[PDB]
Design an enzyme around this catalytic site. Structure first.
Site, PDB file in Angstrom:
ATOM      1  N   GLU A 167       0.817  -1.204   0.000  1.00 39.52           N
ATOM      2  CA  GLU A 167       0.000   0.000   0.000  1.00 39.52           C
ATOM      3  C   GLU A 167       0.857   1.262   0.000  1.00 39.52           C
ATOM      4  OE1 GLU A 167      -1.947   1.306   3.464  1.00 39.52           O
ATOM      5  OE2 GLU A 167      -3.868   1.725   2.473  1.00 39.52           O
ATOM      6  N   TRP A 196      -8.546  -2.378   0.391  1.00 46.05           N
ATOM      7  CA  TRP A 196      -9.336  -1.338  -0.267  1.00 46.05           C
ATOM      8  C   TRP A 196     -10.488  -1.908  -1.086  1.00 46.05           C
ATOM      9  CZ3 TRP A 196      -9.204   3.866   0.384  1.00 46.05           C
ATOM     10  CH2 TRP A 196      -8.100   4.389   1.080  1.00 46.05           C
ATOM     11  N   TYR A 207      -5.109   9.810  -0.980  1.00 46.18           N
ATOM     12  CA  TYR A 207      -3.719   9.777  -0.480  1.00 46.18           C
ATOM     13  C   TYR A 207      -2.607  10.102  -1.486  1.00 46.18           C
ATOM     14  CZ  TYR A 207      -5.762   7.607   3.696  1.00 46.18           C
ATOM     15  OH  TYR A 207      -6.487   7.364   4.834  1.00 46.18           O
ATOM     16  N   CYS A 240      -7.151   9.411   6.734  1.00 41.47           N
ATOM     17  CA  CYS A 240      -6.982   9.323   8.183  1.00 41.47           C
ATOM     18  C   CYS A 240      -5.632   9.876   8.551  1.00 41.47           C
ATOM     19  CB  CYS A 240      -7.020   7.873   8.629  1.00 41.47           C
ATOM     20  SG  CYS A 240      -8.640   7.208   8.522  1.00 41.47           S
ATOM     21  N   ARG A 279      -6.025  11.747  12.043  1.00 43.60           N
ATOM     22  CA  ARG A 279      -7.240  12.342  12.632  1.00 43.60           C
ATOM     23  C   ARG A 279      -8.122  11.333  13.359  1.00 43.60           C
ATOM     24  NH1 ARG A 279     -11.750  10.976   9.751  1.00 43.60           N
ATOM     25  NH2 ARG A 279     -11.403  10.441   7.552  1.00 43.60           N
ATOM     26  N   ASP A 285      -8.158   3.878  14.335  1.00 47.51           N
ATOM     27  CA  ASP A 285      -8.644   2.612  14.850  1.00 47.51           C
ATOM     28  C   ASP A 285      -7.491   1.841  15.512  1.00 47.51           C
ATOM     29  OD1 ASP A 285     -10.291   0.208  15.117  1.00 47.51           O
ATOM     30  OD2 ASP A 285      -9.064  -0.527  13.440  1.00 47.51           O
TER      31      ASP A 285
END
Ligand SMILES: NC(=O)c1ccc[n+]([C@@H]2O[C@H](COP(=O)([O-])OP(=O)(O)OC[C@H]3O[C@@H](n4cnc5c(N)ncnc54)[C@H](OP(=O)(O)O)[C@@H]3O)[C@@H](O)[C@H]2O)c1
Ligand SMILES: NC(=O)c1ccc[n+]([C@@H]2O[C@H](COP(=O)([O-])OP(=O)(O)OC[C@H]3O[C@@H](n4cnc5c(N)ncnc54)[C@H](OP(=O)(O)O)[C@@H]3O)[C@@H](O)[C@H]2O)c1
Ligand SMILES: COc1cc(NCc2ccc3[nH+]c(N)nc(N)c3c2C)cc(OC)c1OC
Ligand SMILES: COc1cc(NCc2ccc3[nH+]c(N)nc(N)c3c2C)cc(OC)c1OC
Lengths: 507, 510
Positions: A287, A309, A335, A395, A415, A418
């Site tokens: 990724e 994804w 991104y 994120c 931000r 998890d």
């Protein structure tokens, strides 16, 4: 589209060349800590022999036959090699490394075919240095120092002690003034401990040896305290205990805390891959490379067996975000696109975007190489204008770089985090980025600083998380590169290897 | 304009009338006894003098107390009654008496002959008196507030809500033991329940003295203060930087000691304003600049005309030319800070141009989400625009802020890439304190927590010596923000609308 790429400098491999290989240690001691008379091993305990053979032969994966391709190595001092009857050497199933300044490799074969023996003219450091070379890394899975007093002594001080990952100690409950050589683990916060704090991972109950002498004995696994992972574990525990109940977009429950910070050392090839629950590294790696390339087609990950994804790239989801004109798996200007092409007008993934928008990554690579003191060295994916055109908002939305003493530190601002899956994944992700960017600028890896906004645990994950909370974090693994590549964007997942990753099983 | 943000109709559920900061002055025996319910059991003129001097004196050189600028003393009715009529009221101090029976007109009358408009009855306890002394009527005149007590008044002073406004305790210990005393005073010790989360510390203690009352009565003074954990948290960072920071050099080539990545938290609850006490923060500047940010302004002349010259160097003809911005007129800073907040991504031309509807109004969206869906995780505004960067006078320093709701309180995170601890940081802490307070008002939440993330936190090499002197200082309490009037639109707030109460920072370091 080749002149838009990042060119890797002539000093690329030296940035991430592994100086010493990580190793575990395996020893037997009496209650006074004695290991032998410098000649032979005093006690006869067959159950220690079985343990010793097992800990040193068995490989991580189940039922994997030890072979030249993948096996463990045992490093020993010359006198220890002599204490083994010539009939039973070399130790089968393992690579036998012998430290001696008078006996060469061929000389060891003279005495008592196939290859399982190497001599080293030097101490344990030299052996770990050799085992760090491509021919042994990553073919050799685990290195064990099976010792001899002087070898143990070298293992338990710098520079080697900082590569010591586990101690497997057998205590034989006997005593005698017949022991000259001694083995002692430095206690927490002492000078000899050189900053390390040995934790007990496991201890066995006192067993009795069927050796005719009714000898008592037990096993212990000691590990070096991993405060970095404890940072994370603490945060999770604080979230469950003190966090606020919140509900995300779907309506799923969450326990939440606001504002937090963690640090992870990237020095000497060290990779902060969490040990209390195995992280999906291959996907982490795939990724990030996908990000760095400014890629927005998710199928490129799906194709390589990375489906993280998959759900966000489906027709079902894209429609629910009103992105009804996106091809399936085309995720919009997410991104990487913002990293390499900030503010560039997006149409479809397969369009050409060369020299369009701002190339933040390239800019940073150029700034680090010339003005390392610069305080504006940061990229971001948070683009209010692009946001509605994305399948998902970022994120991990911002990172800033920092240079000190030729070391590249990097801070990431996330931000929404998890703690269950995102956080550990993103920790590794930005570790890799900082490593790669350091390689691209002729710097060494420094620290990764993680900043969290809304840090959360999922309500149903509380029960699983609580079980993990009771695990003692183990030492981090290491990252090494099989090969370099001329351009940054050319790096593949198979170009780099994660070594000595020994996470806990799932539960 | 109605491209503006319309303020809510009401004060956020749970909000409170502004309370004044006060010190407490008390005389106790060793058993902790203060009086017999009627009078003081002992005679120690030296305490009398100490009491007069502590409650009368002002901060100035030789500032005579006047109705224009003076202290106030709050007392229970019984204490007033214990002071012999011919010494009421206590000179040079506003006399505030607590009673449900006696009124102002009841209090004067009972006086012997003579005027004394330095008396005010309060039908309520210490809370009511601290509210009263926060009035626009009293905040000019009344400099420091003292709780001179009565057992019941001391009791109220030592518990919530009041205990949180207690800035110091001046205690005289009389080394007599009287079995008489039926009324008591105990300062709760750090960590105990009665301390209710306050950490009391001894700032000073006199040597044991002997009274000249002709009984050789031993006595001593001590000053007790509540620990300001949050300023301690700041100072510890500063001190860690000086001791462990790396030598670095800025754009000009000036030396700095620096560290990378730190995080601080400050409480904003009930409009507590974290203006640092150990070095005065230029509040007026902080305020004017923020409202300037909120309005989306980019013309620095708007700021320098209000006597706020922070942007001067960065707005000059010379500087703008050097950044390549040959088109901007003097003081036109380009699409900076506020412009990005209210018009993210809008094409810029000049400061005087109309930008309504253009770009993204990040603030307006955030306000909107807070009101409707406060568990959202996308409530953040950025000024870091890679496209707009080269057209700005300076790249943004405080470049990202995230909002968070919990227990009907609005918290907020600020990301700062470059942090000068001496001047830039304490200024920015106040900037986002105010912002959070305003956005809380704008969305009908009460203020929560300000979390501050620092990127490159540094101290300037030349500033190292002055810092060490400042580090030796003991942090005082944080002031409060009081909105003296309101506005229909968030953008319409003038600096004059708000009063910072009880900000008493240290003088300048030499
Ligand atoms: N209880 C246990 O589990 C356990 C395990 C192993 C050993 N032991 C006991 O430990 C005792 C032997 O320990 P001890 O150290 O005498 O021997 P130990 O280190 O095995 O062996 C020392 C030898 O290794 C080679 N060597 C070590 N360091 C070197 C260096 N820096 N450079 C070059 N060569 C180096 C040298 O031999 P050359 O000069 O010949 O090159 C050195 O003489 C025996 O009792 C052994 O049984 C106990
Ligand atoms: N050692 C020292 O430093 C020191 C200093 C001062 C006083 N003292 C001692 O304190 C003793 C008396 O104190 P103690 O508490 O009995 O009395 P303390 O309060 O002075 O006086 C009692 C008065 O408090 C008023 N009060 C308190 N809360 C009120 C409220 N919420 N609303 C209206 N009125 C309120 C009451 O007024 P109403 O009852 O009229 O409603 C009452 O008359 C004196 O004997 C004196 O010796 C010692
Ligand atoms: C079992 O095969 C043999 C192995 C050895 N090696 C010595 C020896 C014995 C126990 C040990 N136990 C532990 N925990 N760790 C060791 N390093 C260890 C060693 C190093 C010596 C032998 O001759 C006595 C022998 O044949 C019996
Ligand atoms: C101010 O002058 C007087 C004050 C009082 N008030 C009682 C009294 C006595 C000592 C005190 N000492 C301190 N540290 N703080 C006080 N609050 C205090 C008070 C409250 C009583 C008087 O009658 C004797 C008197 O006349 C001398």
């Amino acid at each position: 589209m080749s002149l838009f790429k990042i060119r890797m400098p002539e000093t690329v491999a030296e940035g991430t060349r592994l100086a010493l290989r990580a190793f575990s240690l395996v020893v037997a001691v009496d209650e006074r800590g004695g290991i032998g008379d410098g000649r032979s091993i005093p006690w006869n305990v067959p159950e220690d022999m079985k343990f010793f053979r097992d800990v040193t032969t068995k490989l991580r994966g189940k039922n994997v036959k030890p072979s030249p391709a993948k096996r463990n190595a045992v490093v020993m001092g010359r006198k220890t090699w002599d204490s083994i009857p010539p009939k039973f050497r070399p130790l089968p199933g393992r690579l036998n490394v012998v430290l001696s300044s008078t006996l060469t490799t061929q000389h060891l074969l003279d005495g008592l075919h196939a290859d399982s023996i190497v001599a080293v003219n030097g101490g344990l450091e030299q052996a770990l240095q050799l085992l760090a070379s491509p021919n042994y890394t990553p073919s050799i899975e685990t290195v064990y120092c099976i010792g001899g007093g002087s070898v143990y002594a070298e293992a338990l001080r710098p520079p080697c002690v900082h590569l010591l990952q586990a101690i497997y100690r057998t205590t034989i409950r006997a005593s005698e003034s017949s022991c000259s050589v001694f083995f002692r683990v430095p206690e927490s916060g002492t000078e000899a401990a050189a900053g390390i704090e040995w934790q007990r991972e496991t201890i066995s109950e006192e067993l009795t040896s069927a050796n005719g002498n009714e000898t008592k004995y037990y096993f212990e696994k000691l590990i070096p305290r991993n405060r970095e992972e404890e940072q994370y574990l603490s945060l999770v525990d604080r979230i469950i205990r003190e966090g606020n109940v919140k509900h995300d977009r779907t309506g799923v429950g969450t326990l939440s805390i606001f504002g937090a910070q963690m640090r992870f050392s990237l020095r000497n090839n060290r990779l902060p891959l969490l040990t209390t629950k195995r992280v999906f590294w291959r996907g982490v790696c795939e990724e990030l490379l996908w990000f760095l390339r400014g890629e927005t087609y998710a199928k490129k990950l799906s194709d390589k067996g990375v489906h993280i994804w998959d759900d966000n790239g489906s027709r079902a989801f894209l429609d629910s975000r009103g992105l009804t004109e996106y091809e399936e798996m085309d995720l919009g200007p997410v991104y990487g696109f913002q990293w390499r092409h900030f503010g560039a007008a997006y149409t479809h993934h397969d369009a050409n975007y060369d020299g369009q928008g701002v190339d933040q990554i390239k800019a940073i690579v150029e700034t680090l190489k010339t003005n390392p003191d610069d305080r504006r060295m940061l990229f971001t994916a948070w683009n209010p204008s692009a946001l509605p055109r994305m399948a998902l908002p970022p994120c991990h939305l911002l990172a800033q770089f920092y240079v000190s003493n030729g070391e590249l530190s990097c801070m990431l601002y996330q931000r929404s985090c998890d703690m269950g899956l995102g956080v550990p994944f993103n920790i590794a992700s930005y570790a890799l980025l900082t490593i790669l960017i350091a390689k691209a600028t002729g710097l060494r890896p420094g620290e990764l600083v993680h900043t969290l906004g809304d840090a959360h645990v999922y309500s149903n994950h509380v029960e699983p998380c609580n079980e993990q909370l009771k695990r003692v974090p183990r030492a981090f693994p290491y990252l090494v590169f099989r090969r370099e590549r001329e351009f940054l964007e050319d790096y593949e997942e198979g170009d780099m290897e994660v070594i000595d990753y020994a996470p806990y099983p799932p539960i």
